[PDB]
């Protein structure tokens, strides 16, 4: 499904991403927007046999297993399909595990480029959550 901006922020809040390890809710809303336009079914293949899945475009070479990616590490111990659900539970859990690494949200290149160091609070600005 394709979330509404505010609808997604409310969900992300319910799922505890707001202020998770020092990252305000805006950061996550902004990241989702630029990564998949709030689309849970979004996918994108890469040069290697890996694919980015879900609202947060999580890679299948290091984070999830789709049973067909060379050098899969499945760090999130989850089937990549779980990241395409209308239920964001799984994508959030994995995102939290990713951001829990030393380099934090810098894992999402799209975040650094268009969200990192910006007034991200703008993304939840206006929402009645």
């Amino acid at each position: 499904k394709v979330f509404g901006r505010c609808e997604l922020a409310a969900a992300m809040k319910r799922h505890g991403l707001d202020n998770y390890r020092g990252y305000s809710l805006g950061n996550w809303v902004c990241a989702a927007k630029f990564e998949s336009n709030f689309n849970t079914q979004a996918t994108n293949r890469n040069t290697d046999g890996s694919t980015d899945y879900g609202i947060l475009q999580i890679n299948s070479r290091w984070w999830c297993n789709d049973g067909r990616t060379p050098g899969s590490r499945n760090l999130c111990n989850i089937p990549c399909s779980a990241l395409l659900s209308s239920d964001i539970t799984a994508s959030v859990n994995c995102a939290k595990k990713i951001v829990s690494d030393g380099n934090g949200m810098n894992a999402w290149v799209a975040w650094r480029n268009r969200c990192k160091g910006t007034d991200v609070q703008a993304w939840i600005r206006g929402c009645r959550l």
Partner: antibody, heavy 113, light 109 residues
């Protein structure tokens, strides 16, 4: 299938270094982030710190100064080093996956001269 | 400062078959980043509930969790004979991760 097991000196003298090993079996140590958790005498748990799947680390501030966590990708083990111990470091030490889904049986380390 | 988790009551005595509710309060809001652990004597801790209310495949259905922010509850629908021991909550919202002081489930007689 993934299983953890702690091992190391059960006795450490005050001011010396506490060293423990966690052997990861059934899977690669590079296949997850890992932690060290200790249990003091009155059911007081402390999350000492964890080492990511990348090798980077996060140390409990109260210990940031005495603690070091490392890993060995060839032997599939990660370690805990804790300097200048005192009787207060006496506790049951456990290693666990960052997710908390796997835990070693834990091992007691006693600090005494 | 570091997040403080307060669990109550310190100890709870029940008869197998009854239901119980264990409390855990955080000194600061942690949204849903609260996890519940069980630890039986001579055994290592076991994760029962993750992120406040998500169930772990393989954990008996009688165990469930609720709450958000600073107020969380672990519920056991009809405590079973093998359910007695310690119960601790733990937050992963901010570093350092911290544990509550634990609640002890003991048998009533």
């Amino acid at each position: 299938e993934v299983q953890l097991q702690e091992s190391g000196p059960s006795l450490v003298k005050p001011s010396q270094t506490l060293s423990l090993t966690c052997s990861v079996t059934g899977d690669s140590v590079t296949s997850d982030a890992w932690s060290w958790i200790r249990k003091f005498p009155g059911n007081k748990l402390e999350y000492m710190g964890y080492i990511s799947y990348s090798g980077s680390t996060y140390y409990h501030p109260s210990l940031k100064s005495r603690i070091s966590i490392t890993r060995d990708t060839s032997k599939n083990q990660y370690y805990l080093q804790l300097n200048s111990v005192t009787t207060e470091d006496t506790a049951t030490y456990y290693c666990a996956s960052w997710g908390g889904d796997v835990w070693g049986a834990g091992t007691t380390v006693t600090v005494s001269s | 400062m570091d997040i403080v988790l307060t669990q109550s009551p310190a100890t709870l005595s029940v008869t197998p078959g009854d239901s119980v509710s264990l409390s855990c309060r955080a000194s600061q809001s942690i949204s849903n980043n609260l996890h519940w652990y069980q630890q039986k004597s001579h055994e290592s801790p076991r994760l029962l509930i993750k992120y406040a209310s998500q169930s772990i495949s393989g954990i008996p259905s009688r165990f469930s969790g609720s709450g958000s922010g600073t107020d969380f509850t672990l519920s056991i629908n009809s405590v079973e004979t093998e359910d007695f021991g310690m119960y601790f909550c733990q937050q992963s919202n901010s570093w350092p991760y911290t544990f509550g002081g634990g609640t002890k489930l003991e048998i009533k007689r």
